Design a protein around this ligand. Structure first.
Ligand SMILES: COc1cc2c(cc1OC)C(=O)[C@H](CC1CCN(Cc3ccccc3)CC1)C2
Ligand SMILES: COc1cc2c(cc1OC)C(=O)[C@H](CC1CCN(Cc3ccccc3)CC1)C2
Lengths: 540, 540
């Protein structure tokens, strides 16, 4: 047995496993318990630290996926099922994973901490596209990723109550960050150089950790890929969170008619229900027909988030913080097949004008008829207001700008103007092996496999250019993790990545071509979402 | 003795004058009375036909300019003085002019009828840039132009009353069209081929003759240069027209202190005032601070205009009609020096952001704060929201699109989609002799001198290519007058001018270069003005 596959942490001993990459081995410690199993009376409660254990915990394989909805839109399709759970579901899921180089670093090494996305209702650290063996081998970094409770188990909230306070899934991530502080040195990791990175709901989580003081001390840099805490989907109000939790209780027979009412009797009834029963009614508590809206998300309650993310972003001091943010080329196209009329992954989705006007209401729920008119005005090409291909790309722009691109640009500009050093990108390469239709372009989430170096997997059919491209991206992310600057610390030959500033708004395009600098993250479109539309909603 | 300078019309005999051009002489009959002098009790009343006369009326020189405000913004400046009256002011001003080729045409020849602009408060057929000798010589058509009452004398209105019904200036133009029908044959002109063309308020007048049945029978084609009857400045409501007329009465002491003020006593008191006194208070009755707004304009009374121009445009059947419409490249820049803060013709007018925001309220008066926010949203470059040059061009676009380009675009599309054959242009040549500053671009009204072939004047310093350019334009205008199609009926080699359609929205650019076809008359900007902004004001 190799001695480096045995490690002692504060709770006991672990045995890891050695993973192969074409460039060399990596030591992995998969399935480390960092919290007590949040089961029975602990359902909906904040996590408690894992009590110390005797013997050697086996850390050679991923642990269970947290209970979550399983996507059935295209059964058997690679594009959807690559995100579905690949381990059995269980409420016993609070486990984390540590990848470390071989040989183990003798000097403290910067640490990357991955937070998976999935709309706060799904996701797992065990997904194949989150395999950290290639990023750790190529860049000699320590990589950590945790599981956190999603859906009702992580974010059902009766605000104010002690039995279901909400945001416990965010607290799971924090506890994992506290664990990295106390234990990552045992793997050769530097707890003074901890960079967070996450995609979609993981990116929003990273943002919410920036805005929560108890979390802000546990890390030093942030990477937000295609997501932001200020998004219209990433938070809900106290009243709406209470209404969703009460309706979920009703759908599963809580409280038993008609005995019950207060929050204590409601959560107690919810705690007796099998986990699969709660999952089976999760989507039915959404208030309207929509896409890119999720039932149980972080709640703005005054505790984890003392104010709304937008308020904390505006009032925040971010001096001494380095941030990397970005988006993919087609943020919205993915979501249209989940409810927008006329869309299908198996045809060209050449929608009609009427289907476009209906899709706007699904893509922008809970706006006045007048607000929808402004959206139609801004996203119609009035030289070709009936062209199906342009309408398809326009509805994609509507959903992507409203949910991802403009919340990210709002955040990136506020951070740079308030002390943070910001770098911005737009990912523009469509994977050659992508199974989604060509009209979706570079869809939401399909930069992750390049960040994690998946093209290096010899059992995959990526092109030679994509392997070089993945290595360049891993260098950018690692350089940012080590130094706070994605640019090569001294290489002047490679094109340079300028910081993002509220004035110049410079960002780079990430594709097979060398870096190219551009200005403005859809500046015209995002002025509509960030500046005008709120003023329109005020005066109804 | 040239006998062709002698003509008999229905009212008597006339003696014209021969005008010289570099290409040959032209016979001109300037100052033909077509109405009784609208003086004394006739002030504010519809015109009456000129009673027949004995002897030979001298028609060798232009008659008096109708009483009007004289522009004093830049005293002594060519750019402003070229529009001021160049003959004595008088209420005895209802005279028209006829140019005809030499030798007189023996066959009935198509007739161009010019209607001058000037915001319905100014203008005169005697202005040097309306000299018809070059258009008539080069293209062998008959040209007619009339004087019509402007300001209070043409458009003061107490709706309902008989003493000041309004729109009498439009009736003056109609009477001149009736005169052309009854008399233009005596000059070699074909009353079955009459093309109206006008600029600015003249273009708005031409449009209102399309929408008035009694006038619609007196002509066969329309040309609307930089103006439309549906503009926000071209008409006024009954209630507002009554308020303006009543305030004018108050400012000139009408009615006297302690006197009833029904419409009869008010107009009677107004008729006793010297004409210059009414002029001296004309601008004081505008309801708020503005540019491109005029005190006395056509009123939507139910008589001359049975409904609003917009309503009549939408419900109208225009089969059998050919229209030529167009705009200059920089419609708005001219007006900014008449009230927009920070603007001056003698500097670069590099306005600040605050001046831009103030200018929007002056350029778009009578809109809510939310409407102004939408205007700022649509016209700000949010990548350079403080750049003075871009803000200067943006406010020019605001004023020009709101007042000219979008009313013209809406009209052109409704005409083409409802039976009319339509041709559209954008005039993009800045005269080499233009005295206005370079930042104004191609300002409002500076295509007229090219349409009338003024570059051919030997006493002017136009370039050789501007002389050739002027000849192309006169050919386009005359071909449209003859056939209804500006394209050369012979030459297939010359670039073709496609009709404007509500779908393809094709137009051509007019400059020193050959014709270039483009699509959309600022389609994105005009969707804001024509589609969204009305919905925004309805919801207040
Ligand atoms: C079952 O009902 C619904 C299911 C979904 C929606 C709405 C629904 O009801 C209307 C959505 O809007 C979802 C669309 C996302 C699902 C996950 N993928 C993949 C992905 C996962 C993690 C990171 C990045 C991409 C992207 C689109 C799912
Ligand atoms: C004295 O008060 C005012 C005077 C004017 C305005 C506002 C005023 O008060 C705010 C305007 O908006 C006017 C601007 C026009 C004046 C004449 N020219 C020239 C022209 C004449 C005829 C056809 C084409 C061009 C174009 C702009 C004048």
């Amino acid at each position: 047995e190799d001695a480096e596959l045995l490690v002692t942490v504060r709770g006991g001993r672990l045995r890891g496993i050695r993973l192969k990459t074409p460039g060399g081995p990596v030591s992995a410690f998969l399935g480390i318990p960092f919290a007590e199993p949040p089961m029975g009376p602990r359902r909906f409660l904040p996590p408690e630290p894992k009590q110390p254990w005797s013997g050697v915990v086996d850390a050679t394989t991923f642990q269970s996926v947290c209970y979550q909805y399983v996507d059935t839109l295209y059964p058997g399709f690679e594009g959807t099922e690559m995100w579905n759970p690949n381990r059995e579901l269980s409420e016993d899921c609070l486990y984390l994973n540590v990848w470390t180089p071989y040989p183990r670093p003798t000097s403290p090494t910067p640490v990357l901490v991955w937070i998976y996305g999935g709309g706060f209702y799904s996701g797992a650290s065990s997904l194949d596209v989150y395999d950290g063996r290639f990023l750790v081998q190529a860049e000699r970094t320590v990589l950590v990723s945790m599981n956190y409770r999603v859906g009702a188990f992580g974010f059902l909230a009766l605000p104010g109550s002690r039995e279901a306070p909400g945001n416990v899934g965010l607290l799971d991530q924090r506890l994992a960050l506290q664990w990295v502080q106390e234990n990552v040195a045992a793997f050769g990791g530097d707890p003074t150089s901890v960079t967070l990175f996450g995609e979609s709901a993981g990116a929003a989580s990273v943002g919410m950790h920036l805005l929560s003081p108890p979390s802000r001390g546990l890390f030093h840099r942030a990477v937000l890929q295609s997501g932001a805490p200020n998004g219209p989907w990433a938070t809900v109000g106290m009243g709406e969170a209470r209404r969703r939790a009460t309706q979920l209780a009703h759908l599963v027979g809580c409280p038993p008619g008609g005995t019950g009412g207060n929050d204590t009797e409601l959560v107690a009834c919810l705690r007796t229900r099998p986990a699969q029963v709660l999952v089976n009614h999760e989507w039915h508590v959404l208030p309207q027909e929509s896409v890119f809206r999720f039932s149980f998300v972080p709640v703005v309650d005054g505790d984890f988030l003392s104010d709304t993310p937008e308020a904390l972003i505006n009032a925040g001091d971010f001096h001494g913080l380095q941030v990397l943010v970005g988006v993919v080329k087609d943020e919205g196209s993915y979501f249209l097949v989940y409810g927008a009329p006329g869309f299908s992954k198996d045809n060209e989705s050449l929608i009609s004008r009427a289907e476009f006007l209906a899709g706007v209401r699904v893509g922008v729920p809970q706006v006045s008829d007048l607000a929808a008119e402004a959206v139609v005005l801004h996203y119609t090409d009035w030289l070709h207001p009936e062209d199906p291909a342009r309408l398809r790309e326009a509805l994609s722009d509507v959903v992507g700008d409203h949910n991802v691109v403009c919340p990210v640009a709002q955040l990136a500009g506020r951070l740079a103007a308030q002390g943070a050093r910001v770098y911005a990108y737009v990912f523009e390469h469509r994977a050659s092996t992508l199974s989604w239709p060509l009209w979706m372009g570079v869809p939401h989430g399909y930069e992750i496999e390049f960040i994690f170096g998946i093209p290096l997997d010899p059992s995959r059919n990526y092109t030679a250019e994509e392997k070089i491209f993945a290595q360049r991206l891993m260098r950018y992310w690692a350089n940012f993790a080590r130094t706070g600057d994605p640019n090569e610390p001294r290489d002047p030959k490679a094109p340079q990545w300028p910081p993002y500033t509220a004035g110049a708004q410079q960002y780079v395009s990430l594709d097979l071509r060398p870096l190219e600098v551009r200005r403005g993250l859809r500046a015209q479109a995002c002025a509509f979402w960030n500046r005008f539309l709120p003023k329109l909603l005020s005066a109804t």
